[PDB]
Design a protein around this ligand. Sequence first.
Ligand code: CL
Ligand code: CL
Ligand code: CL
Lengths: 263, 263, 81, 147, 217, 217
Amino acid sequence: DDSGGFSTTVSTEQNVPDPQVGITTMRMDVSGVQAPVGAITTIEDPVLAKKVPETFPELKPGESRHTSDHMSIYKFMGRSHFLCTFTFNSNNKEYTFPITLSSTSNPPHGLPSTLRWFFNLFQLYRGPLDLTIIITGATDVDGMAWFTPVGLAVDTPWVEKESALQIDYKTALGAVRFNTRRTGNIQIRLPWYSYLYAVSGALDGLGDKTDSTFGLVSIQIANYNHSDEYLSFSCYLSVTEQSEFYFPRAPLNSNAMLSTESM
Amino acid sequence: DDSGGFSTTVSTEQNVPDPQVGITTMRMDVSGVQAPVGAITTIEDPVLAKKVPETFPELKPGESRHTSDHMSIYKFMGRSHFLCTFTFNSNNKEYTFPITLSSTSNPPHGLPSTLRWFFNLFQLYRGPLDLTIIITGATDVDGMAWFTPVGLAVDTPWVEKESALQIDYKTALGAVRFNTRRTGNIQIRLPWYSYLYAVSGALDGLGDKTDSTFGLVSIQIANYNHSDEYLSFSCYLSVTEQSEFYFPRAPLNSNAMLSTESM
Amino acid sequence: DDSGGFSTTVSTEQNVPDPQVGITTMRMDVSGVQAPVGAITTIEDPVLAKKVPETFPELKPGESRHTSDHMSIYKFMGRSH
Amino acid sequence: ALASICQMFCFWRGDLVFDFQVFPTKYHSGRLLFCFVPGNELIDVTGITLKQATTAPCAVMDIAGVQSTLRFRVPWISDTPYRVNRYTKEAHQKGEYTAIGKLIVYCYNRLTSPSNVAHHVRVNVYLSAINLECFAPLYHAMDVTTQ
Amino acid sequence: EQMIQSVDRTAVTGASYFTSVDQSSVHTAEVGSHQIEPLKTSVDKPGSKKTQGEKFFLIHSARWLTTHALFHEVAKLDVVKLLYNEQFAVQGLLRYHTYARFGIEIQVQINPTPFQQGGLICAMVPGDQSYGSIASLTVYPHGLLNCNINNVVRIKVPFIYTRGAYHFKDPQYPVWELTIRVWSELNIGTGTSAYTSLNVLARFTDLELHGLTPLST
Amino acid sequence: EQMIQSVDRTAVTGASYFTSVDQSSVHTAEVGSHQIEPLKTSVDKPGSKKTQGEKFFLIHSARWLTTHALFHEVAKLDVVKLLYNEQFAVQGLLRYHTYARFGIEIQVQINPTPFQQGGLICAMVPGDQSYGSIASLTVYPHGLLNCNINNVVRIKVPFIYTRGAYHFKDPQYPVWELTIRVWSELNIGTGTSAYTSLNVLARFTDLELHGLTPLST
Ligand SMILES: [Cl-]
Ligand SMILES: [Cl-]
Ligand SMILES: [Cl-]
């Protein structure tokens, strides 16, 4: 140990990341007609505990019928999962929602379902995210959206109100404009712009207010005479290849897994 | 015979799959000025029965004028055939229809016309399927659809009602969103996600309830003030190259071939 | 084990037939001036139990004066009883 | 952990691994027989003599020892390539199963001991899997299986 | 320094699907070894999976009459289910394994007197006949019987199912439903026997058993 | 001159121990062939004689008490006869063969608390104990148990009998009579458990079955 420490017994890796593949394949038997020594061990000892488990004679499983391995985070979370949804009531108004891993913030004012679950499987996250948002209802409604990084000015969260920000400021942080008639959906990438090294969901109050946020999104409508239908917005997030995940946590207990029950 | 069995007479292949091509081509005469020995045989004997039939002197047919062989299942069923159709009456509602080979389930609550016929020509099916669905009527109607695998939660079949599923859950199984105005049709591939090796149409009650289903599709509308026109949906299926077909059955007798008579 | 059985400890022969001759002969000492390890054992264990018994330093017995070995069943029961 | 992951899949297959950790004292003595009965998640099994259980694959463990955990690697045995997460459905349907059978803990040799030590011995059961495979993403927060 | 032998505490033994972990162990005692009969006490192949499981057994047996109209089903049998029954040795294997996959060989025979005429058809249909055209039964692995010709037929098939194996104790749907129907009315002249009995033989092939179980139902 | 194919009247078919002679025969029809799971539906060794017959099973189980005097027979068992019983899978093989020869492996275990003391002896005696000296039981393939030492013993033997095989349905005399007696009274201190349960495991080895039979008794 370079830290000036010494020991007589060893120190092996405990709970090592990505140990085996997630699809049945051959990376004979898997164990058999020999003697299952891995049927007994002293779990308290980290070394011994890694001894491969084996109890009876088995054969090699074989090959899975499907191409890709569904257990590769990149591919799994590659399926843009649900994030949140809101609805505009008056014209020339705006909504601003934060992207917060916080296990504390319960939906709708917080991370829901899968996304909630996923982001609490590990301690640190960093890297871009591909947000995609679906428009529901209205038509011929001009709209705009911008990504605001943690620690900067931005209209009050989880609240529909008249923007209090200079058009200049908004556009300046990089923004996008669209119209319900011509589209009905937007898929744009959110940058890893933060003064932190990474963000986390599992935290306590204080840090849970600064270090638990990727950033924020703000959507502002225009030309929406409410003589028209209603205007709904739904947001979904998908992890990118440039996204990283460090240190595995114990998954959230079921009682804390919540979902925004609707339809 | 590796099974410890013995015999004195032989055992040849009976009714072998894909015996000849389906287009007139040369894979002289086909038989003639010799002696038609294949004009007589003892059909009860499997060997003898395979003896090539020949009764009179004929010449080689020649070459067909069209490129592709219409009798290749892949190419034939490659023509997305009709499956089902339904219509929405109220707003914010949903329909869920299962993809069931069952010869039992009669349309509209079941496989119709060609698809019905085809899936009863053989015992086992497995492999992805390219579903394509046409939208009729309405406009500026936001919609969503998701594929649900056999054995999991899903709104009650063949019935229009208000969904009883968490938006989270729905989206989680992989879903799609669209709007009548911008499109009017959707062509997406259905996966071979089932705990079974394959599915079948010809079965009896019990199995006919679990092993006769590829999976299920669910379509949910939104923003459809019925002050508007009606909203109709039509679904068609086309077999993919990754689809497999095992063991030929005796085709369904005509009386069981039904079609959803409309227009 | 050809019977599809497995083990981690061994399996030695227990109580093997015709282990030694029955007449005093040489088939030095028999044990001595060394250390009698065969003075201690765990009889419950079949292997260990076969460990040759030895407690004190002894010399080789030598040669019996009579030709045939009276403990050979064939010769003993050879006497019509 | 095992659960929290698989709960987000429709299908799964592989060798589930049950680890039994005993918390005795160097003064107790006993044996427990772990028995896997191949089947589905709902098979009346209370009508099974210990003797009867030895027919199914199983393992016995001596508690009193220098070691503390017996590992039970339950081989993937099924009539289907994968099992399904029916724990989302309203009711149950013959054939749509989540498990490949049930595990049983029998008393092989009664627990002996003096009198200045507990009248029992607790046991922890960990769970993990090897050669695990899951596919077909979905969302569901599995509840507790109240045995 | 001489090390003195002391027993080996912990150890693991077992056979087939039974494992034991022992903490206060010792070695195993054995005597003599396997002996081969210089003079066999029995000359038949020693019992084996094939011996007892992959052999033939009489399943069902019925009558075929002059009264039986065309297409009359003379027999509808869940081949597999039928074998699973104490009546046959193969049971001993099935009765203790939860699932199993396999192929089958069917032999159907009869004994019509040359003074009789007509015929039957025997088909191995997977699952259920559903609504398949009776007239197209020839498509399934079949055997045709004609009085004037043959009095026997043999069909051999592999495992065909939706699942990776059949569950005996509590099945989903029969693997095979062997059907035997009148292919051509059995007529005769005045005086001849107006019937012919019929039997059905079956056996498994490439019998793959899985998961020993104590259950019975 | 062209010869025209005509069926082959006579023929002989069968499998294992079942033969058929057919006079108005024809050829056998077969479809497809054996398929090997590219993805196995089950990873356990496919059922085999060894799988189901040469594995371990719990025979009998009793108690050993402080009340049990020296040499007290804690158990007298007809090992073989005991295995022959529906309770165990191996039955499925025995139940259908008339005779069979084999070897055996016995495992006897207990769980005495280190606060207990004493011991037992386990012997595999062929036929009957007759009037053999209890004190000489060590002669038979045996295993000794001592609280302070081991809590298990294993004995393995081959076929030893007067006949070339054992007849299950109706035996002559038991092949093996496993005896378990108190080798040294089991005493204890005031407060300790005054007993220890005990189990017995058995399995066949080199199982040679002979003559399939429908009988049961
Ligand atoms: Cl317009
Ligand atoms: Cl406001
Ligand atoms: Cl409703």
